[PDB]
């Protein structure tokens, strides 16, 4: 093929400046009550024989 | 008093002890609870209660 400039010159649509994140989750801050205080769907208290 | 945290495995222990003969450490948690289960239904004494 012969070469024709015009037709080979294309413009470019590119976004600009990301920052890609993996793992995710991590951003989650989470603690836990003290075991002696649990509950199931029940809501009364899992493990309740003092 | 809502003491949901003064796990009663406590009182029973002392109780039994105070009537020597019984090798406390050498007696499971089970029976113990059941022991509470019956105690619970017991009336206090004017003195105590009052």
DSSP calls for A9-23: --------------S
Q: CA A49, CA A41: separation in Å to the nearest integer?
A: 18
Residue B17: phi and psi, rounded to 5, are -45, -60
Residue with tokens 């470019």: A12
Q: Which two tokens stand for residue A29?
A: 């801050």
The alpha carbon of residue A33 and the mean position of all alpha carbons in its chain are separated, in whole angstroms, by: 25
Query: Is A37 in Cβ contact with B4 (below 8 Å)?
Result: yes
**Nearest-angstrom CA–CA distance, A32 and B43:** 39
Resolution in A: 3.8
Are B7 and A48 contacting, i.e. CB atoms less than 8 angstroms apart? no
Largest distance between two CA atoms of chain B: 36
Between CA A13 and CA A49 the distance in angstroms is 66
- Distant-in-sequence, close-in-space partners of B7: CB < 8 Å, separation ≥ 6: A36, A50
| Method by which the coordinates were obtained | cryo-EM
Chain A residues near any Cβ of chain B (below 8 Å): 36-37, 49-50
The DSSP 8-state label assigned to residue A25 in this structure reads: G
Does the distance separating the beta carbons of A50 and B4 come in below 8 Å? yes
**Degrees (nearest 5) of the Cα angle A14, A16, A20?**
110
Note whether B33 contacts A49, CB cutoff 8 Å. yes
Q: What is the largest CA-CA distance in chain A?
A: 89
**CA distance to partner chain A, nearest, from residue B16 (Å):** 18
- A-B Cβ pairs (cutoff 8 Å, strict): 9
Judge: B4–A49 Cβ closer than 8 Å, yes or no: no
* CA–CA separation, A19 and B1 (whole Å): 55
Contacts of B32 (CB under 8 A, 6+ apart): B9, B12, B13
């Amino acid at each position: 093929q012969q070469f024709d400039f015009r037709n080979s010159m294309h413009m470019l649509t590119s976004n600009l400046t990301f920052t890609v994140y993996s793992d995710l989750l991590a951003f989650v801050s989470a603690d836990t009550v003290e075991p002696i205080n649990a509950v199931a769907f029940d809501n009364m208290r899992i493990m309740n024989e003092l | 008093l809502n003491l949901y945290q003064k796990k009663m495995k406590a009182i029973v222990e002392d109780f039994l002890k105070r009537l020597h003969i019984f090798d406390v450490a050498r007696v499971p948690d089970d029976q113990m609870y059941r022991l509470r289960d019956r105690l619970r239904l017991l009336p206090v004494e004017v003195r105590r209660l009052d």
